[model samples]
Target: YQVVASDLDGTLLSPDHFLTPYAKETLKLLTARGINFVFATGRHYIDVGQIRDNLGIRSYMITSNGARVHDSDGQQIFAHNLDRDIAADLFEIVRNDPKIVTNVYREDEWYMNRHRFFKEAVFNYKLYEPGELDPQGISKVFFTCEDHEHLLPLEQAMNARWGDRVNVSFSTLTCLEVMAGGVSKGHALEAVAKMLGYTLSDCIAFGDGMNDAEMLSMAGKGCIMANAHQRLKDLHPELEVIGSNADDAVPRYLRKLYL
Candidate 1:
């Protein structure tokens, strides 16, 4: 395979957010075989890169739900900035609903409202009046709710109002991600591949969320997590539904297919 991409949180990472030994060895094997490995996920680039370093993997990263793409050495090759006005508007929409938690990012800097209970959600961020702080260079806006029942209606309403200006998709059952329209893992992957002198059809991708839906369909071979979102599993009939992330499914499958 020319390329192999996988989402981090629930696809390449175990439930606890660490790469299992098997997965690490598998990546090492992929390195040995000359297959490119990339982590495509909703995480911030800094955190993703830290994980990449800890795992001893040198690969490109597609982060912030594809709003930013970095080369193997952490050089930015692509960026889709979420309009500052749109970020303010989204912050308003997300703030009014006490049920939804907001996480806003402008590159490496994150803005959150005081008393916003992000708990274990945010890794590193700053506290600010989200609606009042309309900053430039904003790359991503994330909203997390209690459940699908609470999130779906809000998602529908947000899409109805802002669909023309921004892209909206669920990163997880409870988290809705908003970015510049047409920005997604699928588009970013294709662009990155072309930049690297390859085609999208030469890449294999793995993911397990609604946000991953586009990339899964775009890859030459879409591998779904056995614990993948049901909506994703239903949508891609041809996806290879492999083992669970906790079981180190990516490594297992890679060993069988390429090693």
Candidate 2:
């Protein structure tokens, strides 16, 4: 594969959310071999940028579930923000929900309705202390909860109301993200591959969430993580199920195939 695109959280990162030493060394080997590594994730650009820097490898960043994309040179080449009307309605739907915490992302700025510390991997956040949210500038909107299954009704309502006008999926079982129509990791991967003079058929994509459905299917080789959500597995039963992220499966798989 000319391009290797993989999701971060549950697909690439360890359960603790840090890249293992073996994974880093193997990626460096792949980078040395002239293969392009794309950090395809649902994370924000600013947050994912730090991870890219830590890895010390050049990569195209697909952030916000593909609502935003940055080239290897850190130049933004694509953006697909949520529509104003749709965003406003979406913000309103869970605005009063006591259990769900809503987050808004506009480029680099991240705003949250309440303070919630869900994981150590996520260090970037700001409390939307103003008590009001402006949906006009939203690039993506996500809700966090203790149990991802608890968000089913909200997801159904969104699908029922907006239909294809927006894209909604679970990055993790605990986080539900919404973006504009046609915005997804797969779409961003395709755009990045074309920019880099390759095609989806020349890419190998890895993911373990419902949000990665499109990217996995569109890639020439789509490998699923053994620890992936069952929903993602059910969506692509034909794709190869790989080792768990806990075992540094991404780099191990690459080393076996390309090294």
Candidate 3:
């Protein structure tokens, strides 16, 4: 594959949220070999940009679950913000549940309703003041809870009400992600490939969540992690299941193929 597009969390990151030495080296070596790498994640660009900086590589980034895209130079090339009216409505719907913690990612910062914090849910963020935040210019909205099941009702409600107008999926078991319509890793990957004068067939993709479903399927070669959510595995039985992320599977898989 000429391009390697991968989801960050369970696909490339270690269990501790860092990339192993081998993974870092593999990424560097792959770049040296002239294969383009793309960091695709549900994280904010600023957060993923730091991770990319740590990796010391210049790579395209698809962040906020594809509502935002940046080139290797860290310049934003694409963005699709959620509709103001729709976002306002979603906010009302989501805030109705006291159990769910609502988070909003805009152009620059991440805003949350309260002080409830989940380690995996945020890295760089701010807490919204009373009547301080509105739903315009938002890239994505995230609903987080202690249990994945706890967010299901809200997810169902959004899908039932918004339908195809908004793109909703889970980046992790405990995080429900909402992007604007037509925003997804798959759609962004296509755009990125085209921008580079390439195509999806030139990409080998990897991911471990339902949010990754579209990207993996769109790429010519899609590899799912063995540790992926059961629903993801069941949904794409045709895709190959690789070793788990705990074993540093992504770099190992790449090394086997191209090292």
Give per-model TM-scores.
0.91, 0.92, 0.93
Candidate 2 per-residue lDDT over residues 1-259, each given as its tens digit:
9999999988888887888889889888999999999888888787775577677688889999888888768798878899988877766677677889988896677888777723324546777644366766577999999977789888998988898888999887788889998999999999989989999999999999999999999999999999999999998999999999988999999999997
Single out the weakest 10-residue window by summed lDDT for candidate 2.
116-125
Instruction: Give candidate 1 regions above 4 Å deviation.
Output: 117-123
- Clashing residue pairs, backbone N/CA/C < 3 A, model 3: none
Note each model's CA RMSD in angstroms.
Answer: 2.9, 2.6, 2.7
For each candidate, what is the lDDT?
A: 0.81, 0.86, 0.87
Models ranked on TM-score: 3, 2, 1
Can you write out model 1's per-residue Cα lDDT over 153-196, one digit (the tens) per residue? 87798788877678888888888888888888988888877876
**In model 2, what is the error at residue 87, expressed in angstroms?**
1.0
What local lDDT does model 2 show for residue 218? 98
